[PDB]
Design a protein around this ligand. Sequence first.
Ligand SMILES: CCCCCCCC(=O)SCCNC(=O)CCNC(=O)[C@H](O)C(C)(C)COP(=O)(O)OP(=O)(O)OC[C@H]1O[C@@H](n2cnc3c(N)ncnc32)[C@H](O)[C@@H]1OP(=O)(O)O
Lengths: 62, 62, 63
Amino acid sequence: QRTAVQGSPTMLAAISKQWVRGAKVEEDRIHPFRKYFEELQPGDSLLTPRRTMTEADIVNFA
Amino acid sequence: QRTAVQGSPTMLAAISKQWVRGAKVEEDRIHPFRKYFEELQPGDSLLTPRRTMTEADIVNFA
Amino acid sequence: CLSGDHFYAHMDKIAAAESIFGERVVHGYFVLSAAAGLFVDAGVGPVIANYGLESLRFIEPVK
Ligand SMILES: CCCCCCCC(=O)SCCNC(=O)CCNC(=O)[C@H](O)C(C)(C)COP(=O)(O)OP(=O)(O)OC[C@H]1O[C@@H](n2cnc3c(N)ncnc32)[C@H](O)[C@@H]1OP(=O)(O)O
């Protein structure tokens, strides 16, 4: 049965057992590439440090 | 005997047979890396050419 | 160096021998970047923007 489930994205994430687009995140102080498959939860996020794009970046990549 | 020798750094260089911080220098038109050990004097200096630090230098070194 | 991707299968010689690949392999994003280095015209033409990428799969490793 094809059901169109509505609701908040943090609700659709827990319904679908995935992470969708605007759901809440589980930032837990260690890098998710260190976790094995069984301890990765859908929602395990990571806020990386920034990087300033410069003209030298464009030159070196081109 | 431990002796605190006061004086100018260009005098402490000649006393200590070393170079100090503000002693006189012996710039002699050839490179001190070309000299052997016996013809290196403490005070043989070299004023190098310049290099302008840019954002591309930071990017390429990082 | 440029991308910043210092993954062990690319920058380590020991762990790449212990990995699934056998030795150090080229980055997949460098295959993707050097490809666009090969097929893109430099001159001004009808092509305007990159707009996205549809469906990428890396099949065999590049050494
Ligand atoms: C940067 C973010 C990630 C961080 C980690 C970085 C790691 C790296 O940088 S590695 C960089 C280089 N990349 C690689 O070398 C990728 C290696 N290639 C592979 O995927 C390997 O086949 C391997 C062994 C790892 C897994 O493949 P394997 O499952 O054993 O068999 P395979 O035949 O490839 O099938 C898997 C996928 O390949 C695709 N595929 C295989 N053959 C074909 C083909 N002829 N045509 C189209 N697609 C194909 C399939 O679509 C399949 O995908 P799907 O999930 O849709 O079914």
